[PDB]
Amino acid sequence: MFRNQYDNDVTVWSPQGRIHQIEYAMEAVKQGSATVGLKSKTHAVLVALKRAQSELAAHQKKILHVDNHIGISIAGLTADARLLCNFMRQECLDSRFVFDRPLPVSRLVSLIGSKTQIPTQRYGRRPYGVGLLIAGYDDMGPHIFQTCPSANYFDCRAMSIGARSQSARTYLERHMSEFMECNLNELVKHGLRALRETLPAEQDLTTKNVSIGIVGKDLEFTIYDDDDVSPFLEGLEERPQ
């Protein structure tokens, strides 16, 4: 009842030492579809789920291409995702044009965090309402990162964000001890099994609502969609129940 005066702007502190607009912007991530990321000793994989809307009126691109060794997936507002993708592409292009060397993923994520911290302290702006999962390969190996509207980032072994992603997170933490020794096929199957845990217990994954993105030591970032996904979905078994 006493929060009405302190939750309209990002530049107002609450008497309890809180900023409610950042916490509200953190709720916009749960309005998107679920997505899962996981990694092994050699490869990093992203899988995404598309809305049940008919493909007739929409061609959604949840997984985007950033560089030859970096790819992302989105959950949240779309304009902010577009702006962040443009910024990342420009950074990678400038780095490559100046020095003939790939830009490290950790440096890229640090730049992203520094950029997104600014609109949380200045009047007349609002935080970015989008969360990202980032997969890449560099001299240190494969990496998975997570990004938050509060300008925080984490280094993960496996993560899931979106709507009803708690089931996927539970599955990932239950089966997380076997990911390092698996090959590409087993890794993708584990990702698909984690992703399908967020659906009601009568639907199943089809070749119309699933996207896959893979990067590796010798494999550039590639996106599999529509009919290219069937060789990955064919080996998956039926539901336990």
Binding site: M1, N8, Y24, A25, E27, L56, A58, H59, A79, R126
Partner: protein, 229 residues
């Protein structure tokens, strides 16, 4: 344990407690005061059908230009606040002409789409636009169709219906549409959808069509061609 008022829908930079921006949603709801438009994507071409409403018989039925055509083999259609599309059209035309003057070929539909989408996102003008667009054209990739809403972002599609009565038009178009059809079949489908959506007659002075296909350039149907159907 008392009931109090609280508002979150007066500024474009305010988040709701459940992570919603209400001003953008209201701007999107403003589209449903416009006229219905139809777009269909076919391997042979793209057909744009738009609705023209006349308030009085004394109005000249020629100044209601809803299908504006940009160069580089590109169509357009509109619904909502017509006065708000002029800046977008000017930006698209300037970008295309600069591309001609610097490279001497045609800019792609996706590229002009992205370029015009950059300008619609600058409200974060201090308010979102109140208009929706539909783009058509063919390139080396073939025919393409795109849609934009006042949120400021585009999305590729192949059969979309926008306007005041759009849900029923989309439901009918989903059934009628097939993966393969002829351009004339698509035109007939658009015409019948417009017929069963309109509340009035369909003489050659109520609609406006401009079917584009890789054979020749822009071709907006004349009065005689429209009256033929």
């Amino acid at each position: 344990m008392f009931l109090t008022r609280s508002e979150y829908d007066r500024g474009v930079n305010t988040f709701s407690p459940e992570g919603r921006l209400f001003q953008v949603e209201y701007a999107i709801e403003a589209i449903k005061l416009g006229s219905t438009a139809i777009g269909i994507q076919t391997s042979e071409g793209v057909c744009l059908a738009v609705e023209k409403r006349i308030t009085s018989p004394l109005m000249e039925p020629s100044s209601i230009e809803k299908i504006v055509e940009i160069d580089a083999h590109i169509g357009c259609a509109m619904s909502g606040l017509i006065a708000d599309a002029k800046t977008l059209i000017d930006k698209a035309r300037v970008e295309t002409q600069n591309h001609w003057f610097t490279y001497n070929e045609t800019m792609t539909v996706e590229s002009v789409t992205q370029a015009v989408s950059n300008l619609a996102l600058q409200f974060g003008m201090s308010r979102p636009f109140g208009v929706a667009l539909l783009f058509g054209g063919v390139d080396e990739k073939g025919p393409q169709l795109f849609h934009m809403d006042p949120s400021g972002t585009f999305v590729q599609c192949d059969a979309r219906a926008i306007g005041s009565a759009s849900e029923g038009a989309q439901s009918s178009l989903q059934e009628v549409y097939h993966k393969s059809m002829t351009l004339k079949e698509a035109i007939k489908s658009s015409l019948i959808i417009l017929k069963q959506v309109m509340e009035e007659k369909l003489n050659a002075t109520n609609i406006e069509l401009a079917t584009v296909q890789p054979g020749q350039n822009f071709h907006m149907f004349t009065k005689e061609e429209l009256e033929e159907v």
